[PDB]
Amino acid sequence: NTGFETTLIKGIEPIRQFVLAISIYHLFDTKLFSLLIKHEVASPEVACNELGMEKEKLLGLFRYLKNEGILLETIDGFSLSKEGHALAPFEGWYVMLVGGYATTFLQMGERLQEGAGWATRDATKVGVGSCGISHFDAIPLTRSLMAQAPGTCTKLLDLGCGNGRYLAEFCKALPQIQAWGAEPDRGGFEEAVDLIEKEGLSHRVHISHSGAVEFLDSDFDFEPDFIVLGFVLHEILGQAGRPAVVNFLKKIVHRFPAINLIIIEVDNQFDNAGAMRHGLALAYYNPYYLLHCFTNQLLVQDADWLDIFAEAGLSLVTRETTSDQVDSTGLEIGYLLRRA
Amino acid sequence: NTGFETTLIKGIEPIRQFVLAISIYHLFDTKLFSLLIKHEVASPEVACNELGMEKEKLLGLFRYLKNEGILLETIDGFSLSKEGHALAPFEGWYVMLVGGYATTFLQMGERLQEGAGWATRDATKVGVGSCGISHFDAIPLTRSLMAQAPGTCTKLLDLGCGNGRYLAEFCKALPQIQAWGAEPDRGGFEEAVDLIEKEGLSHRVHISHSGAVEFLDSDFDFEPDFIVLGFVLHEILGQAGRPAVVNFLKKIVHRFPAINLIIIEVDNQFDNAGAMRHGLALAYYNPYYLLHCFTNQLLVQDADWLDIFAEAGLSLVTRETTSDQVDSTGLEIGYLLRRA
Ligand SMILES: NC(N)=NCCCC(=O)C(=O)O
Ligand SMILES: NC(N)=NCCCC(=O)C(=O)O
Ligand SMILES: [Mg+2]
Ligand SMILES: [Mg+2]
Ligand SMILES: [Mg+2]
Ligand SMILES: [Mg+2]
Ligand code: NA
Ligand code: NA
Ligand code: NA
Ligand code: NA
Ligand code: NA
Ligand code: NA
């Protein structure tokens, strides 16, 4: 086995990073990251008393993270290194892809078998995580499209709202807005009620435990002038089919003829060689397309969505992609539509 | 968010590799890797018929692996690239750390809480995976120590045998040996019975579904002259304590006074700054030490093991580390012992 060790260190580099990604996810999810930001330096004993943890297990996680350069160790205790501090904006990606979809990727081997069904996910962490990401890409994109509409937003409806971050950010920036969010996952719904309460927006924002299609079939007198469907239609498309998506969009404009619809979707370019060599396409969109083949969701192309909108009796006001400072792939597309 | 995308691509690089490590694990575990070696080129339809898989899910995994350069796509179908072919020797590491311990690392957040207990593992994949690794490190080390003993091996006992690879390799190379293996995990035990049958060694090798301590307490007339305890004592140490390890070793030499013991253990240097900067220490030993803090296992230092052996009434014939061509960390140590 001459020279085997050097080949082994490169050969298992994905395993080294696999354990690191899980450990970074727990550092955020358990509140240890925010505790280390607050305390600056914290001994295992102090962190255990504050979060109700066991010393020997916490010291093991801290020693592991110190060896990887995420933490520093002084006589007073452990602290986040400069590299560890720099992880702070990316929390949403770890919570969504590790917390939400680790079980989904681990189920791929068994779900490949004929008739084994769709892989499950932790929809609470998917909702919380994707909402954390939307602060950088989907919320600024929704704002740009809202500004180009022929009317001002007063009553906003967000279906598939996750933990309610889109509504929290839009309501703080636009104090006149009255909003209603709906989230089908119970864990995500409870996170949304808590985030709205924490931000002091319960008097202006209501949250319902409901799916997008059943919300439109339910009875209510609220008359929204804007509806946000952020990464919701591809779930309906996979679960119920294309005629169900067309009928869902027809029901929105039948019930609310003057509404403005803002739809955000990911253009499926999984088999586009050039698009998949972009650094962000390889880091995020390649595993995103993979998880969509194993779950009851279906991503389609930009032209396929425009065809669906035409069939549902909608007219396109404009369409845009995200800022090239956060995501320059051109794969995240936002559409502003009205009744034709 | 000026320049955010470039920071994001580096910030979520551990997530990109996390999904890749899981996908590489399934490529081996589902038999798709061996199918691609055998066929050279295979369309999704051919691979689905042979392994009983669904076309749309398999095409998704193949497109994902093509974008990462693990597979090539021609008009005839998909094939392993040169980089994909080069993964073949490392199967055991993926099966052990991803198949065996992915759930363990994912449970860290919940198991950190006071009184939450030890993290579980898939002991079948741990056994199968570690046995695949032993072909490179622990089996050649056991051979070197066996050659330095004052007697020849005729009757071998392997406690914690996994899928039985140590016994299969030693029996093929030394046709006079009669061997007995014991594995406590039922899945691993069934894999061992099948591997022994597949190799044509059932007439010379027996396998029992049993733990190491309960095997020595059970009744049998087999008189081994060699006993291999490969990464077994640190499980007993964590589960039952130091006096139980000492009593277990005393019972081996009380029952078999002329036996030769070959013990393989990992030296705990988790807090040794210099040792942890070795490329293999960071890739393998850093997550190995972390998983030992969350499971009912305890790794100790080389000197701590020598103290245990002296207390149990044992004399050290010699001790060695692995070949520097496969593992030059000096952390894997093999001990050859006899009754004092
Ligand atoms: N951040 C981007 N691009 N959107 C992803 C939203 C979540 C999603 O679609 C899923 O988890 O299925
Ligand atoms: N390959 C090496 N170094 N041995 C590890 C054996 C497995 C093990 O100890 C565990 O999974 O707990
Ligand atoms: Mg949404
Ligand atoms: Mg989706
Ligand atoms: Mg063993
Ligand atoms: Mg062990
Ligand atoms: Na959940
Ligand atoms: Na990728
Ligand atoms: Na799907
Ligand atoms: Na198992
Ligand atoms: Na590491
Ligand atoms: Na332990």
**Which amino acid, one-letter code, is at B247?**
N
φ, ψ for residue B270, nearest 5 deg: -60, -30
CA distance A141 to A5: 48
Q: What is the largest CA-CA distance in chain A?
A: 76
Q: Are A48 and A54 in contact (CB under 8 A)?
A: yes
DSSP letter (8 states) at residue A119: P
Interface contact A21-B23, CB threshold 8 A: no
Give me the residue label for tokens 């580096």.
Answer: B10
User: Which of A73, A98, A101 lies closest to A21 in space, CA to CA?
Assistant: A98
Q: How many Å from the N-terminal Cα to the C-terminal Cα in chain B?
A: 70
| Cα B326 from chain centroid (whole Å) | 15
By the 8 A CB rule, do B204 and B178 touch? yes
B-contacting residues in A 40-79 (Cβ below 8 Å): 48, 51-54, 56-61, 63-64, 67-68
Q: How far apart are CA B258 and CA B274, in angstroms?
A: 40
Residues of chain A contacting B22 with CB distance shorter than 8 Å: 18, 105-106, 108
Query: Could you tell me the two tokens for B212?
Result: 């190491």
The encoded tokens of residue B218 equal: 């059970």
Closest chain B CA to residue A272? B67
Nearest to B326 by CA among B164, B129, B134, B97: B134
Contact present, B73 and B82 (Cβ < 8 Å): no
Query: Do A320 and A145 contact (CB within 8 A), yes or no?
Result: yes
Residue B33 CA to residue B23 CA, distance in Å, equals 11
Residue A338 backbone zone (phi > 0: left; psi -120 to 50: alpha; other: beta)? beta
Chain B contact probe: residue of A7, A108, A125, A143 with most B CBs at under 10 A = A108
B61 Cβ partners below 8 Å, 6+ apart? A108, A112, A290, A293, B23, B26, B27, B32
The DSSP code for B179 is E
Please work out, in degrees rounded to the nearest 5, the angle formed at the alpha carbon of residue A320 by the alpha carbons of A314 and A325: 160
The torsion of the CA quartet A37, A42, A48, A52, rounded to 10 degrees, works out to: -30
Written as six digits, the tokens of B37 are 């070696």
Of A4, A279, A328, the CB nearest to B326: A4
Q: Hey, of B4, B6, B8, which one would you mutate to test binding to chain A, going by the most A CBs within 10 A of its CB?
A: B8
Q: Give the SS3 label for residue B65.
A: helix
> Using the beta-carbon criterion (under 8 Å), do A279 and B9 form an inter-chain contact?
yes
Q: Does ligand 1 have an atom closer than 6 angstroms to the CB of A126? A: yes
For A291, the 3-state DSSP assignment is: helix
From first CA to last CA, the distance across chain A in angstroms is 70
From residue B84, give the alpha-carbon distance in Å to each of A291, B27, B48, B62, B285.
21, 10, 20, 12, 24
CA distance A55 to A42: 13
A178: left (phi over 0), alpha (psi -120 to 50) or beta: beta
Q: Give ∠ CA A339-A204-A208 in degrees, rounded to 5.
A: 70
What's the sign of the alpha-carbon dihedral A289, A106, B234, A1? negative
Run of H or E residues at B11: helix B4-11
Residue A333, ligand 1, Cβ within 6 A: no
Give the dihedral sign, CA A287/A232/A301/A118. Answer: positive
Residues of chain A neighbouring B20 (CB-CB closer than 8 A): 14
Residues 6+ apart with CB under 8 A from B50: B35
Cα A50–chain centre separation = 29
Nearest CA in chain A to B136: A1
Q: Is B2 exposed, middle or buried (0-12, 13-18, 19+ CB in 10 A)?
A: exposed
Taking an 8 Å cut-off on Cβ atoms, the answer to whether A23 and B108 are in contact is yes
> Quick check: B55 and B62 in contact, CB under 8 A?
no
Of the candidates B244, B226, B237, which has an alpha carbon nearest to the alpha carbon of residue B338?
B226
Residues A7, B280: C-beta atoms closer than 8 Å = no
Name, in order, each residue with C-beta under 8 angstroms of A318's C-beta and a sequence gap of 6 or more.
A145, A148, A336
Q: How far is the CA of B188 from the centre of ligand 10 (A)?
A: 8
Q: Look at the block and give the residue holding tokens 């027996």.
A: B206
B102 in contact with chain A, both atoms CB, cutoff 8 A: yes
CA distance B314 to chain A (A): 31
Say how far apart CA B125 and CA A44 lie, in whole Å.
32
As for ligand 2, residues whose beta carbon falls within 6 Å of it are: B 126, 130, 133, 231, 266, 297, 332
Cβ–Cβ contact A19 with B under 8 A: yes
The CATH architecture one would assign to domain B102-339 is 3-Layer(aba) Sandwich (3.40)
Asked if B53 and A113 come within 8 Å (Cβ–Cβ), the reply is: yes
Considering only CA atoms, which of B41, B137, B37 is closest in space to residue B87?
B37
Closest CA to B89 of A108, A1, A18: A1
Report the amino acid identity of residue A90.
Answer: F
Amino acid identity at B180: W
Question: Encoding tokens for residue B294?
Answer: 């969350």
Structural tokens at position A270: 């999984």
The reply to whether A102-339 shares the fold of A4-88 is no
Q: In this structure, are strands B78-80 and B205-208 parallel, antiparallel, or unpaired?
A: unpaired
Do A14 and B7 make contact, defined as CB atoms within 8 angstroms? no
CB contact under 8 A, A89 and B4: yes
Distance CA B252, CA B272 (A): 34
| Residue A114 CB neighbour total at 10 angstroms | 11
A319 CA from centroid of ligand 6 (Å): 56
Q: Is the dihedral of CA B123, B124, B126, B131 positive or negative?
A: positive
DSSP state of A53: B
Given an 8 Å threshold on Cβ–Cβ distance, is B113 in contact with A89? no
Q: How far apart are CA A222 and CA A180, in angstroms?
A: 9
* C-alpha triplet A218, A210, A179: angle, nearest 5°: 80
DSSP single-letter state for residue A208: E
Closest by CA to B67, choosing from A270, A330, A267, is A270
What is the CATH class of B4-88? mainly alpha
Structure tokens that stand for A119 in this block = 């892989």
Q: Which ligand is nearest to the CA of A166?
A: 3
Helix (H) or strand (E) holding A288: helix A286-294
**Closest chain A C-alpha to B268 CA, distance in angstroms:** 12
Chains A, B: CB pairs < 8 Å: 263
The domain spans of chain A are 4-88, 102-339
Which residue's alpha carbon is nearest to atom 5 within ligand 2?
A: B130
Closest chain B CA to residue A115: B54
Q: Which of A125, A231, A232, A327 to mutate to test the pocket of ligand 1 (most atoms within 8 A of CB)?
A: A231
CA dist B332 and B117 (Å) reads 28
For residues A193 and A196, what is the distance between their CA atoms, to the nearest angstrom? Answer: 5
**Nearest CA-CA distance, residue B82 and chain A, Å:** 13
Contact: B90, A61; criterion CB under 8 Å: no
State the burial class of residue A9 (Cβ atoms within 10 Å of its Cβ: 0-12, 13-18, 19+): middle
